[PDB]
Curated annotation (Swiss-Prot), chain A:
HAMAP family: ATP_synth_c_bact
NCBIfam families: ATP_synt_c, PRK06876.1
InterPro entries (UniProt xref): ATP_synth_csu_bac/chlpt (IPR005953), ATP_synth_F0_csu (IPR000454), ATP_synth_F0_csu_DDCD_BS (IPR020537), ATP_synth_F0_csu_sf (IPR038662), ATPase_proteolipid_c-like_dom (IPR002379), F/V-ATP_Csub_sf (IPR035921)
Domain of life of the native organism: Bacteria
Main location: membrane
Keywords: ATP synthesis, Cell inner membrane, Cell membrane, CF(0), Hydrogen ion transport, Ion transport, Lipid-binding, Membrane, Transmembrane, Transmembrane helix, Transport
Name this protein carries in UniProt: ATP synthase subunit c
Species, as recorded: Pseudomonas paraeruginosa (strain DSM 24068 / PA7)
GO cellular component terms, semicolon-separated: plasma membrane; proton-transporting ATP synthase complex; proton-transporting two-sector ATPase complex, proton-transporting domain
Topology of this chain in the membrane: Multi-pass membrane protein
Site (Reversibly protonated during proton transport): residue numbering on this chain: 60
CDD domains in UniProt: ATP-synt_Fo_c_ATPE (cd18185)
Gene from which the chain derives: atpE
From Swiss-Prot, chain B:
Name listed for the protein in its UniProt record: ATP synthase gamma chain
Assembly and interaction partners: F-type ATPases have 2 components, CF(1) - the catalytic core - and CF(0) - the membrane proton channel. CF(1) has five subunits: alpha(3), beta(3), gamma(1), delta(1), epsilon(1). CF(0) has three main subunits: a, b and c.
Described purpose of this protein according to its UniProt entry: Produces ATP from ADP in the presence of a proton gradient across the membrane. The gamma chain is believed to be important in regulating ATPase activity and the flow of protons through the CF(0) complex.
Portion of the full-length sequence here: 59 to 115 of 286
Gene responsible for this protein: atpG
Similarity annotation: Belongs to the ATPase gamma chain family.
Cell compartment(s), UniProt: Cell inner membrane
């Protein structure tokens, strides 16, 4: 059992760390364009801010699935059961 | 398409006269409109460069 446990600590670290890496770089690209658009058209900011949250829902869609499975493997463990 | 830039020319006298005579009071008639407009500004209080 000791291997089955220890490799889930690394699985959780990859599953949250790669999600954190992608989401942090992804918002730098999306947010940098939101500031560029806001400076060009200050009167369009109410609309651009709402459109940024539409994209933010697609950007984090898979990252949140990864965090949900990583917490599942931390407080429960479908692998330690050897099932 | 570039509203972020608002050149001063787009937000809030050169006078032309002849070099020869024989005109039918063409210079006078304009010089009579130059004096009329200049008056409105002198009354309003502004200075005038030409």
């Amino acid at each position: 059992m000791e291997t089955v446990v220890g490799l889930t600590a690394i699985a959780v670290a990859l599953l949250i760390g790669l999600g954190a890496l992608g989401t942090a770089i992804g918002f730098g690209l999306l947010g940098g364009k939101f500031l560029e658009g806001a400076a060009r058209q200050p009167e369009m900011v109410p609309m651009l801010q709402v459109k940024m949250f539409i994209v933010a829902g697609l950007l984090d869609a898979v990252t949140m699935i990864g965090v949900g499975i990583a917490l599942f493997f931390t407080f429960a463990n479908p692998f330690v059961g050897q099932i | 398409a570039n509203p972020e830039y608002r050149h001063p020319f787009m937000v809030e006298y050169i006078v032309v006269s002849s070099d020869r005579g024989l005109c039918g009071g063409l210079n006078i008639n304009l010089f009579k409109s130059l004096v009329k407009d200049m008056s409105g500004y002198r009354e309003q209080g502004a200075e005038i460069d030409l």
